Design a protein around this nucleic acid. Sequence first.
DNA 1: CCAGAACATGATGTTCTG
DNA 2: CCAGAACATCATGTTCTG
Lengths: 70, 72
Amino acid sequence: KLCLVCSDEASGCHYGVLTCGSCKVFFKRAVEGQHNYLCAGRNDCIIDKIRRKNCPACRYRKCLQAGMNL
Amino acid sequence: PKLCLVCSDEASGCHYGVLTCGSCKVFFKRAVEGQHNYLCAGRNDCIIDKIRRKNCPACRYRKCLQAGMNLE
DNA sequence: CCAGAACATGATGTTCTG
DNA sequence: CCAGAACATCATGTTCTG
Ligand SMILES: [Zn+2]
Ligand SMILES: [Zn+2]
Ligand SMILES: [Zn+2]
Ligand SMILES: [Zn+2]
């Protein structure tokens, strides 16, 4: 039921992992994109339904640690 | 000189009482009028510079107020 | 049911206007 | 020179399509 990356309502098993739709397409664009994402914090941001917008670097990192893969 | 007191980018002039760049100018005005409720994902002390200022509206808004920005 | 594209919408930053 | 609106361009998220 819950996205393992942002804890929003999950939609299905995506890229190996139970995630929401927004996290699905974020992760695909991160991996297949340039993107030199820079954290404004300490590389340990909270990733929420809301706070996931704030830090792509941490969102992407949390995706990987969740086992998201192509 | 001159530098934005909010994000350290080049200031374009004195806006809402403070030396700021144009982007911080419109950001502030947008924030003090808008919805908004912003949430920090870090520890309420994010680095706000030209690079990172898009990351944390909450901290950028905070720096705007600390610098003394206001509508009058 | 899922990947990937598309189509809205959001958030931002520069330019134009008063 | 500055405020506010308008325009353009993102990043993000939902819906359509394979
Ligand atoms: Zn998610
Ligand atoms: Zn971060
Ligand atoms: Zn600024
Ligand atoms: Zn912050």
